[PDB]
Design a protein around this ligand. Structure first.
Ligand SMILES: Nc1ncnc2c1ncn2[C@@H]1O[C@H](COP(=O)(O)OP(=O)(O)O)[C@@H](O)[C@H]1O
Ligand SMILES: Nc1ncnc2c1ncn2[C@@H]1O[C@H](COP(=O)(O)OP(=O)(O)O)[C@@H](O)[C@H]1O
Ligand SMILES: [Mg+2]
Ligand SMILES: [Mg+2]
Lengths: 73, 375, 219, 375
């Protein structure tokens, strides 16, 4: 049925900028777990074509989970 | 080869090819826009030694080549040489097939339209791209600034624009195009280094003069007292090691190079300078736009990496514009790349995907379709 | 790590959990693989009112000891965090302090060592601890559109907790670097993009921590 | 949406939309009656940038628009544009549904009747109001004065009336309508500022001239000695900062703008002036009314906020009317809003609720019903 969505904070919550200085910085940090979380923080590994966003991640995640789901019965 | 439909942002303004993918921060393939040709005979049997050297490979062999920029003042002169530059661009440096990717070219406003039209003809007939667009350099320089309102100064290797844009709308009557840019500053710098005593006449030596211009020049905030300072003492004399041997030491030539950009009477080109083409482009706009052009003056292309050019720019426009105005010369240090970055943004928008000049629409109305779809 | 009190639930699942039950082709049991999907990470940096963050923050603050919260440099009042409110600090029917020892015990049963799980608590303490960093516009001197941190005492405890030098991360909130084939240069972020950079670092750090948790349980 | 049956008082006289609820002191939505349209192409992809800018939002973007008043001299020219003004009025600024509220329009006397009739047709067919009324501007200007007897001067942006009313009865034969009003004074002020040296030709520049008229004009109680005073010294020269830069300094143009209102030979429009249309509207009335028109002369619409215009008005009517009469020019400083305020009073009376032109009575006799129920 009809669902009402308040527009407050959509653009605020799509923002998912995780640019290269944060990943290289936390890869530089001495904690081995934080190195284990960000494998792309190595500057020897070229970062890539690498933009945000959040809704692209949730869209590709629903599409990917939908794919792995519908390959089974 | 590629499992994506990512749009290609290829950007030769006039003097430096930068290219890459849509939705990316840094341009992937950056190399100079030169084609090489051996000006004398070969001797060693079994070498390879093809009669073409394009991009930075030509700068590896620039001692034995006649370097030749195929595009001059934003106008493409030799279409075969520019086809070599594009072939090396997509097939060697960027290393991707143009058949599967839309392309986003760039050019100057007030262009001869055979450049735009024949550029679209080469992009569809030779490389067979599915989609194509002819982006304005300065508008993309405003896309990377994160704004929708501002007047744009970029000043590439062969052209400068000062395109004013207010709230998503450009002002096409207030547009400007001055042909004084970094290559003319390179030739003037070569002339005044000949005046000091270092004779540079070869195109490879001209490339060395371009290197000295990039490394060792600043803008001279007040040119008169800086000129008297350079005439006073040797605190401005700086040594630069040339490739293979003899060092140089430049004095007043360190700052008389970009003063030519602010004063074209040194190179004898009849103009008003950068700071008065900005003010004339603002005064050609209407009355209720100008403080939004004063607070958002963008200076984000090439040939602006001279230190303190925002101080000379703001310090001069403040003398030209009336008082109680906030002259904000926006100089984001990511410039020389911001036209590519605006290419990456504009190629990655959702609204842009019905503005592509595409094949089967190119073939419908021929090569003139760019003058009715693009601008 | 994946539940929160909502407006209409006392306890609600805010992710999808998938389970591989893998058999031999002839019909004998082999194993299984947990896979997480759709972690609502936007709850980590901001909650709608009348709701709750993920339970591990409340159980971590309410259930830990003095030596652990001194090692994590965590105040245990819920008023001293920008990612937590005092209104949903407590409901009835759910006791966070005993459930914390239930989660650490259960984590030991599923098989983690003491400094491993303690390091997980270091990263969770970093995600919660990132919330008290605030920004302000740089205007002395003004050039050009530069973001500034407000205080260093929170940041130096985060950097000491993560064993990183402070000036690298203080650079990392305000500047973004554009590279090339031959060079790289740092341009400024403004005030707002500094806030979304901090929040994106928080929720991405928490989400990738949760995926690493599922990965390490999969062994 | 709204839990009330409060009547809407919408008031566009000719140049400024003011609207609000019945039984209220101040009008809730006050914004200029302009529609905008971008006179050139857009460039920035992903902006919004609809091809309509109405109200004060158009004045936010007036540098890039062709401003166009949809109603001229009280006569609506473009019905689609006025429908945009009403749509923005009820749905955006006032933010209420017209389906649940009666509406109280305003117009000029001696109107072309297709304005009244098609205005009622748009109010019932498009917005579907339950009730509707076509109020006279000047009579409502006498409702806010708290009187039942007086002659009414309002002088809006496109019209002036001088409607005499005695003891609840108007005098329809002694009514007047002069087409000299504030917009013609704005055009004449633009002409004489072109005479001084400041060239204004754009509609946005015309809006700036309207701003200078509102801020920096007075009435010149004796125009001859004030003219010799302005020719004498620079005690009348006043500087006004234009938007974005250059200041102006006006002299005799500060008071020659409303003297055109008192003397239409400056704008070449064949008339008698305001002060003689008042005296002619009094002399067209009968003998035993006139001292009640002298003691209650109301001057309470727009374009009367010039300082001292009551002194010029009383000082001139005293020269026209015979002696031993008490010329009381009632100028309550709540004017420019008093036609809306009289709308609020008249819409909040108890007797008025059987004078509404309503639906199922509109449909009974068609759109001509306004010429038998309203006046
Ligand atoms: N750091 C620098 N200092 C001074 N000049 C520079 C610097 N970097 C590049 N340039 C000049 O800018 C020109 C290239 O500008 P760019 O806008 O990249 O050209 P294109 O028009 O090909 O995009 C070259 O002529 C070069 O001399
Ligand atoms: N303070 C002021 N001084 C001089 N003129 C004014 C002032 N305020 C408004 N005006 C003029 O009055 C006109 C609006 O009058 P008004 O009666 O509100 O119009 P409407 O007929 O829309 O009700 C405008 O054209 C404006 O130029
Ligand atoms: Mg360029
Ligand atoms: Mg009026």
């Amino acid at each position: 049925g009809k669902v009402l969505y308040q527009v407050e904070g959509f653009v605020d919550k799509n923002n998912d900028l995780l640019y290269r200085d944060l990943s290289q910085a936390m890869w530089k940090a001495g904690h081995a777990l934080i190195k284990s979380l960000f494998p792309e923080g190595n500057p020897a590994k070229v970062n890539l074509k690498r933009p945000p966003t959040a809704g692209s991640q949730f869209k590709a995640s629903v599409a990917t989970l939908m794919k792995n789901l519908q390959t089974k019965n | 080869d590629e499992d994506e439909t990512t749009a290609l942002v290829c950007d030769n303004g006039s003097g430096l090819v930068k290219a890459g993918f849509a939705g990316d921060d840094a341009p992937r393939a950056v190399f100079p826009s030169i084609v090489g040709r051996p000006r004398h005979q070969g001797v060693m049997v079994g070498m390879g030694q093809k009669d073409s050297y394009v991009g930075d490979e030509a700068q590896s062999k620039r001692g034995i080549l006649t370097l030749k920029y195929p595009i001059e003042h934003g106008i493409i002169t030799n279409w075969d040489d520019m086809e070599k530059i594009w072939h090396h661009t997509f097939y060697n440096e960027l290393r991707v097939a143009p058949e599967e990717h839309p392309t986003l070219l760039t050019e100057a406003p007030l262009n001869p339209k055979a450049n735009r039209e024949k550029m679209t003809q080469i992009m569809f007939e030779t490389f067979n791209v599915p989609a194509m667009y002819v982006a304005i350099q300065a508008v993309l320089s405003l896309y990377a600034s994160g704004r929708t309102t501002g007047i744009v100064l970029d000043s590439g290797d062969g052209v400068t624009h000062n395109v004013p844009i207010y709230e998503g709308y450009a002002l096409p009557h207030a547009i400007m195009r001055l042909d004084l840019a970094g290559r003319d500053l390179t030739d003037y710098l070569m002339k005044i280094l000949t005046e000091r005593g270092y004779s540079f006449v070869t195109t490879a030596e001209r490339e060395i003069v371009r290197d000295i211009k990039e490394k060792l020049c600043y803008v001279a905030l007040d040119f008169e007292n800086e000129m008297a300072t350079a005439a006073s003492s040797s605190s401005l004399e700086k040594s630069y090691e040339l490739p293979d041997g003899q060092v140089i030491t430049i004095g007043n030539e360190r700052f008389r190079c970009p003063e030519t950009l602010f004063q074209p009477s040194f190179i004898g080109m009849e103009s008003a300078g950068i700071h008065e083409t900005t003010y004339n482009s603002i005064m050609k706009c209407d009355i209720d736009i100008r403080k939004d052009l004063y607070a958002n003056n963008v200076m984000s292309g090439g040939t602006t990496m001279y230190p303190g050019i925002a101080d000379r720019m703001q310090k001069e426009i403040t003398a030209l514009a009336p008082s109680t105005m906030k002259i904000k010369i926006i100089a984001p240090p990511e410039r020389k790349y911001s036209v590519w970055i605006g290419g990456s943004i504009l190629a990655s928008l959702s609204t842009f995907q019905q503005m592509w000049i595409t094949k089967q629409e190119y073939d419908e109305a021929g090569p003139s379709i760019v003058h009715r779809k693009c601008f | 790590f994946g539940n929160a009190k909502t407006v209409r639930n006392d306890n609600s699942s805010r992710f999808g959990k998938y389970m591989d039950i893998e058999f031999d082709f002839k019909g004998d049991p082999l194993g299984g693989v947990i896979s997480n999907y759709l972690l609502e990470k936007s709850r980590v940096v901001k909650q709608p009112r009348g709701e709750r963050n993920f339970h591990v923050f409340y159980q971590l603050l309410s259930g830990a000891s003095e030596e652990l919260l001194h090692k994590l440099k965590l105040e245990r009042d819920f008023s001293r965090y920008n990612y937590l409110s005092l209104d949903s600090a407590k409901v009835n029917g759910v006791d966070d302090a005993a459930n914390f020892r239930t989660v650490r015990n259960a984590m030991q049963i599923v098989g983690f060592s003491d400094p491993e799980a303690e390091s997980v608590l270091e990263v969770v303490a970093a995600v919660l601890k990132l919330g008290n960093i605030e920004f302000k516009p740089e205007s002395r001197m003004n050039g050009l559109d530069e973001s500034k941190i407000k205080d260093k005492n929170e940041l130096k405890e985060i950097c000491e907790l993560t064993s990183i030098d402070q000036v690298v991360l203080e650079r990392a909130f305000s500047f973004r670097t554009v590279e090339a084939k031959q060079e790289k240069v740092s341009t400024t972020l403004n005030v707002a993009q500094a806030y979304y950079a901090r929040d994106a670092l928080a929720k991405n750090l928490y989400s990738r921590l949760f995926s690493w948790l599922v990965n390490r349980i999969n062994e």
